């Protein structure tokens, strides 16, 4: 009773904290709030996954209904057993082939997503969309437009995007100062296919561990 | 100390000898950008980094993290690391350390692979070698 | 039954290994375990013991060791105060 009503306000607790935004309303009933704020707000600690205080047993997810059953890592998919055995609703294989797939072909191979120091998987999360996202931030760059989005845009080949004219009056993108586009800052004769422009960088090892040779263990 | 631009040597008060490396995601950014734009100005960080800033501001405040590269435990407390481009004209540059309780030891980067493959297999042998002797000595007791 | 066994193993592991936070443990009880284990390792490794000896600058090293031993008990602060 008295101890329950003795609690300091969470904002009174914020001042003790160097990173006050992590502390939350429920920290008021922390039996040792001044300590718990220091631990929770300590540098490298990773806050408890928030699926607690929910009674849903951490997975009720509607998204769980729509998750793909599985996908082979493409290196293993090269092994062709996908066609040999149909998992969806005998296939003689070579020892050298499989062994080389894991070792010769797949030594340097690593899953593309993984996760980071403090990455924690909440129920509603799905990594796959973020994998295509990270891969997409990689492939796609300004000045280039795929033929699909080009067809939807109804832009014929050899013709500049509609924002090149408004970009002539307004100016180059503030975010891309080094961006070049045919007809304006960049040679129109170099206009080719899906690329109407490219960023021209103005910036222009061994890491003590350079192996200088790569030799995998041989099965034979 | 520094081995390189992107990697660091460090010891512990408790005797750990480790080496860390900045992630390639950071090396691309600093290689492709000027430092003046880091504090203020436009530097485009992938979506995950920012979400780690608002999600975990305490750990990711520095917006990148060292992936552990090498870790080791030498029961001494290392006083001085020195990175020598060559040890007695040897090609592979070593790093030699003197410990407080006194010791001097080295970490030699292994070129190629089957160097560390053969070394790794030998270390794996000598690791449980006492157990292999115990299992042989056990089987001979089963026969006797 | 299973949880009930985990209670008994809680009593046994707590007996052997001393401080193990069960469910509710006061910060005074737990921080004492922290201090005791940290000092325990500082004096336990001849390495870190040699280190603290020099950085502290004591005349002998066993002064630092038995210092840590004494520093494990709470009343040692008031003991130093009474010197």
């Amino acid at each position: 009773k008295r101890r329950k009503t003795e609690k300091p306000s969470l904002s009174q607790l914020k001042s003790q904290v160097p990173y006050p935004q992590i502390i939350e309303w429920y920290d008021c009933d922390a039996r040792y709030p001044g300590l718990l704020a220091s631990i929770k707000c300590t540098k490298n600690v990773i806050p408890v996954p928030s699926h607690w205080q929910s009674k849903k047993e951490y997975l009720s997810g509607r998204s769980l209904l729509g998750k793909r059953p599985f996908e082979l890592p493409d290196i293993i998919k090269k092994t062709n057993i996908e066609q040999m055995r149909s998992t969806l609703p005998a296939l003689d294989l070579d020892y050298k082939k499989l062994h080389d797939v894991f070792f010769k072909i797949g030594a340097n191979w690593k899953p593309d997503h993984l996760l980071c120091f403090g990455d924690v998987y909440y129920e509603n999360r799905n990594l796959f969309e973020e994998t295509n996202w990270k891969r997409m931030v990689d492939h796609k760059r300004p000045g280039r437009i795929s033929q699909e989005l080009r067809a939807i845009m109804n832009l014929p080949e050899g013709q500049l995007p509609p924002w090149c004219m408004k970009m002539k009056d307004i100016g180059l993108p503030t975010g891309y100062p080094d961006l070049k586009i045919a007809g304006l800052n960049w040679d129109i004769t170099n206009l080719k296919g899906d690329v109407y422009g490219k960023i021209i960088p103005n910036h222009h090892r061994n890491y003590f561990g350079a192996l200088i040779s790569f030799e995998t263990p041989e099965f034979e | 100390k520094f081995l390189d631009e992107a990697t660091v040597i460090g010891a512990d008060r408790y005797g750990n000898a480790w080496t860390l490396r900045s992630p390639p995601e950071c090396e691309k950014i600093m290689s492709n950008h000027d430092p003046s734009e880091l504090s203020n100005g436009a530097i485009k960080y992938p979506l995950d980094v920012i979400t780690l800033q608002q999600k975990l501001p305490n750990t990711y405040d520095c917006k990148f993290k060292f992936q552990l590269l090498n870790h080791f435990f030498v029961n001494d407390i290392i006083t001085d690391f020195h990175i020598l481009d060559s040890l007695s004209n040897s090609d592979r540059p070593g790093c030699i350390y003197m410990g407080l309780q006194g010791t001097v030891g080295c970490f030699i980067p292994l070129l190629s692979k089957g160097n560390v493959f053969m070394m790794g297999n030998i270390e794996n042998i000598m690791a449980e070698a006492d157990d292999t002797f115990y299992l042989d000595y056990e089987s001979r007791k089963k026969n006797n | 039954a299973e949880k009930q066994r985990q209670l008994k193993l809680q009593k046994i592991y707590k007996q052997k290994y001393i401080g193990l936070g069960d469910e509710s443990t006061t910060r005074e009880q737990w921080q004492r375990n922290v201090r005791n284990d940290t000092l325990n390792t500082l004096q336990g490794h001849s390495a870190s013991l040699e280190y603290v000896s020099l950085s502290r600058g004591d005349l002998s090293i066993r002064d630092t060791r038995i210092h840590l031993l004494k520093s494990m008990s709470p009343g040692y602060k008031a003991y130093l105060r009474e010197e």
Binding site: - | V74, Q101, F107, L110, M119 | -
Partner: peptide, 29 residues
Amino acid sequence: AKDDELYLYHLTLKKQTNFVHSCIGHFVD
């Protein structure tokens, strides 16, 4: 892609000199 993965080879050139324990017995003849 080349894996960085620095492979370090630890050697103790000179062995720890602070002598923490001793015994007086006669071991080998």
